[PDB]
Each structure stands twice: as structure tokens, then as C-alpha cells.
């Protein structure tokens with residue numbers, strides 16, 4: 096059975112995705128919510144919760160309530176459209192302009208995370224949710240269990256004294272330090288590739304090259320027939336995200352200023368979707 | 383003034399070293415103790431405390447009591463002999479056999495830390511204490527503020543899925559992962575060098591080469607005149623600890639099985655010092 100405190104406030108309903116996620120209705124409002132159930136662990140949950148509570152962005156999922164019981168119960172706003180994954184499996188093809196709308200929201204979200212010292216670390220189609228079944232909708236990033244919070248490094252502190260006793264490898268690590276966030280940009284790269292093309296850039300399907308070797312070499316599977324129907328600006332951005340060198344890799348800022356996203360129509364549709372979401376919540380304002 | 387709870391149990395006394403460390407007497411026993419005062423921070427203290435409470439080794443400092451107040455008060459067993467630092471400053475020279483006795487205890491201590499998933503990260507003469515003013519005494523490692531606890535890596539967890547979305551640099555980091563403890567072995571290397579020779583291997587004294595460059599290149603300042611009076615087994619062990627490559631660097635096990643420490647006299651003197659320390663604490667045993 097469900098905890099009594101949960102039951103007090105919500106009627107539980109069907110399962111939505113896989114911990115697990117159920118549909119529920121909040122008694123007070125009769126409105127639909129999502130409830131994420133994480134079995135008993137605590138670190139991932141405590142951080143996701145601490146993160147989502149402090150974060151505030153249209154393309155980051157918001158937490159509504161939390162229950163610490165025989166299991167963990169996280170109450171989130173519901174995403175009716177489901178996983179981006181479902182839109183790209185079975186070589187299903189997202190039309191390029193839809194890719195742009197989605198990816199643009201993904202970039203803003205991840206930019207926001209990074210501005211705020213958060214690295215997601217597990218970005219993939221499964222963790223990107225669509226706000227409705229419309230093809231033009233808002234997307235929100237979820238599943239912050241694996242994320243990491245940047246902070247005043249032990250490295251920084253170490254650099255404040257004299258390295259009389261300090262090992263060589265620590266000093267060498269200084270060259271590459273502070274680029275952990277770049278792992279999110281690689282992931283977005285892969286996600287964008289998949290969205291545009293309907294297939295994964297790195298894969299074991301019909302290769303003798305190991306997955307590991309394709310990834311470290313940076314050599315994605317380029318299928319001209321499929322990519323031919325895709326713009327050259329799009330593929331160019333993909334190429335700047337799939338850069339092996341983390342220091343050379345495009346950041347979110349560079350991605351956002353890339354020509355492929357200089358698209359005033361797209362930004363309009365997004366702004367449209369925004370105020371539309373917010374219509375029901377808007378208080379009157381001093382004019 | 384000192385907190386009332388501290389005062390209740392101890393009479394505070396003179397300062398010993400620099401947070402700060404004072405001499406004190408425990409009222410119950412009239413015995414001397416050391417009290418480490420750390421101003422207000424909490425992470426270093428909570429970890430040192432959590433570490434020292436769970437650790438149990440003749441060459442690791444033991445905690446006696448703790449006070450969480452306007453400041454942090456840690457009550458440790460007193461080390462009458464002071465810092466190893468004082469024995470090596472002003473080009474003062476430790477006689478080789480004393481070096482061996484001390485370093486051997488240092489190796490056991492740090493081996494113990496490593497067996498137990500602890501990395502010290504701040505080993506230097508200042509953090510090595512002598513148990514008495516005798517030249518043949520026990521040493522104990524202190525100052526565990528900067529230490530790190532090894533645990534089930536986020537890296538390990540990441541390796542359990544498919545890296546479809548996983549950045550190249552994470553995969554590359556696998557080659558070198560799990561050798562963080564080697565930074566302690568470098569430090570011991572430097573400490574041993576200084577003990578044997580009376581001077582630092584890496585230094586800005588009379589060089590145009592940057593400190594950073596000497597360390598990453600591995601090129602210590604070798605002064606034959608000073609080292610001539612030093613055994614060749616000793617210098618050999620030093621050389622195996624000052625290895626730039628962390629994977630090639632001697633571990634504590636390798637250091638302990640190095641010929642320079644195959645010295646039955648030395649181990650005897652150490653065992654002697656042990657049972658001697660413990661004489662006052664020994665309960666009778668079933669024979």
C-alpha cells in the first residue's frame with residue numbers, strides 16, 4: 096500500500112514510465128500530477144530534491160511535494176506528452192524544425208544548469224519530457240539523480256599553498272580542470288544527432304569498431320542518404336558538439352549563437368508556448 | 383573565554399603549535415592532553431573527526447573528546463616530542479637510521495589509511511608528530527582535515543550502462559582512475575628526501591626553473607656532496623617514490639618491501655617502543 100500521508104493528499108493512478116512514475120490526482124485541486132517513486136539511494140534523491148527545489152526554469156521540471164517513507168515519493172508537475180525517446184525510436188524521424196524547437200529549449204535548460212553550478216550528467220531522450228501531445232510543445236529536463244554540484248574546489252585550495260610536497264599529477268590536472276560541464280554538451284550533441292537522423296552516432300550495429308573506440312576517436316557513423324535530407328547548418332552544430340577535446344567542444348552559449356538557432360520563427364513559437372503555459376497562473380500587474 | 387563544557391573537564395594551558403593547539407590537563411586523571419582549536423570549516427572538521435573516531439593504529443593520532451561550540455575543540459593524546467618539521471629545518475640532519483625508524487612508521491600509517499579507503503593529501507613534516515623528546519620514539523600522523531574517503535565511484539556506476547551518450551573524456555579517465563592514493567606516496571618521497579639530506583628536492587633556491595616545472599618533470603635538486611654521506615639503498619627508495627607517473631610510482635607495500643627497510647634492528651626498536659607505550663594500558667590475558 097501507499098503511505099497514509101501520500102494518500103491523504105492524492106489519489107494514485109496508472110503507471111506512466113520507468114525507479115517508477117505514476118499518474119495521480121491532487122485532492123485539493125482535482126488536477127493531474129506525476130509521482131516519482133524511488134525504492135530504498137538517499138544521496139541521489141536528496142540532491143535531486145535539493146536541486147529541483149532551488150531551480151526555477153520553464154524547461155526544468157518543478158517539484159510539487161515530497162514523501163520520505165517506506166519508499167521515496169516525489170510529486171512533480173505532469174508531462175502529458177511523454178518521453179522524447181518515444182519520438183525517436185524505431186528510426187522515427189523528427190522534422191528538422193521540430194528538432195530545432197526542442198533542442199533550443201534543451202540548450203536554454205542546460206545553459207541555466209551550468210550558470211547555476213549544476214551538471215546533469217545523464218542527458219538522453221528518456222530524460223527529456225514533452226509537455227503535451229502537440230508537436231509544438233514545451234520540453235522539460237528531468238532525472239537529476241546523477242547530477243553534480245560545482246563548488247570551491249579542493250584543487251583551488253591546494254593551489255593556494257606552495258607545492259613543495261604536492262604530486263606532479265595534481266599540477267597537471269590544472270590544465271583541464273573546470274570543464275566537467277562539457278560532458279553535458281557532448282550528450283546534447285548525441286541527442287541532436289539522433290533527433291535529426293533517426294539513428295545513434297555511436298553504436299555497435301554493423302561495425303567491427305568497439306563502441307568505446309568510436310567515442311574516443313570521435314568517429315560517428317555518417318550515413319549520407321539519411322543526412323542528405325537534413326540541413327547543413329544543423330549537421331555543422333552537431334559537429335561542433337561532438338568534439339573529443341572537452342576544451343574545444345562547443346559550450347551551450349556557443350551553441351545558442353550558432354547560425355542554426357538564429358531562427359526568429361522558432362523563438363516566436365517558443366515564446367508563444369511560454370505565455371500560453373503561464374496564462375492560467377498570471378496575476379495582474381501594476382501598469 | 384573557553385566554553386563551559388570544555389572547562390568543566392579540562393584545565394587549559396600554554397600553546398604548542400599552529401588552527402591552533404594548546405596543552406591541557408584532564409581533571410579526572412590529571413594527565414596532559416592536547417586540544418586542537420579550529421575557528422568558525424565544518425566539513426574538514428566533521429571528516430577528520432569521523433575519520434579519527436573510526437581509525438585505530440599506533441602511528442595515527444587518536445581523538446579523546448570533541449566540543450562543538452563558539453569554536454571547534456578537538457581533544458587529542460599529547461605528543462611531547464613536537465613536529466618532525468623542527469628536526470629538519472635549518473638544514474638540520476637526521477641520522478640515516480633515525481630516518482629509517484621514522485619513515486617506516488610513516489609507511490605503516492599511510493598503508494593503513496590506504497587499506498581503509500582514506501587518502502591524507504597533506505603529508506609534510508609539520509603533520510608528523512614525535513611521541514617524546516627521545517630520538518627513538520613513536521611518530522603519529524595528524525591533521526586529517528584535507529583527507530578524502532574513497533567510495534563506490536560515480537565512474538564505476540557510469541561504466542555499468544552503455545556509453546551511447548557518454549563523453550570521450552570520461553572513458554579516457556578510466557585508464558588512470560583509482561590512483562589518487564599515489565599522491566600520498568609522492569609526499570612521503572619528498573618527506574624522506576628532506577629527512578635524509580636536510581634540504582627540499584623541489585625548491586626555488588638558486589634555480590631559474592619554476593617550482594611547477596621541477597615537479598612535473600620530476601627533476602629534483604641532487605647535491606652529491608650532501609648525498610654522498612647517505613646510503614645508496616635510501617636514495618634508491620627515494621627515487622622510486624619520486625616517480626612522475628602515478629601508476630609506476632611505488633605504493634606503500636612496495637616501499638615496505640624495499641631493501642632499505644629490510645632492517646631487523648630497526649623493526650625491533652619499533653616493536654620495543656610499541657609495547658613500551660602500551661605497558662600502562664595492558665590488561666591481563668587468558669594464558
Ligand SMILES: Oc1ccc(-c2ccn[nH]2)cc1-c1nc(N[C@H]2CCNC2)c2ccccc2n1
Pocket residue numbers: 111112113116129131156171172173174175176177178221222223224237238239
Ligand atoms: O511527468 C513527469 C514529471 C517529472 C518527472 C521527473 C522529474 C525528475 N525525475 N523524473 C518525470 C515524469 C515522467 N517520466 C516519464 N518517464 C521517465 C523515465 C526516466 N525519465 C522520465 C514518463 C514516461 C511516459 C509518460 C510520462 C512520463 N512522465
Ligand SMILES: Oc1ccc(-c2ccn[nH]2)cc1-c1nc(N[C@H]2CCNC2)c2ccccc2n1
Pocket residue numbers: 398399400403416418443458459460461462463464465508509510511524525526
Ligand atoms: O600533540 C598533538 C596531538 C594531535 C594533533 C592533531 C591531530 C589532528 N590534528 N592535529 C596535534 C598535536 C600537536 N600539533 C602540533 N602542531 C601542529 C601543526 C599542524 N600539525 C601539527 C604541535 C606542535 C608542537 C608541539 C606539539 C604539537 N602537538
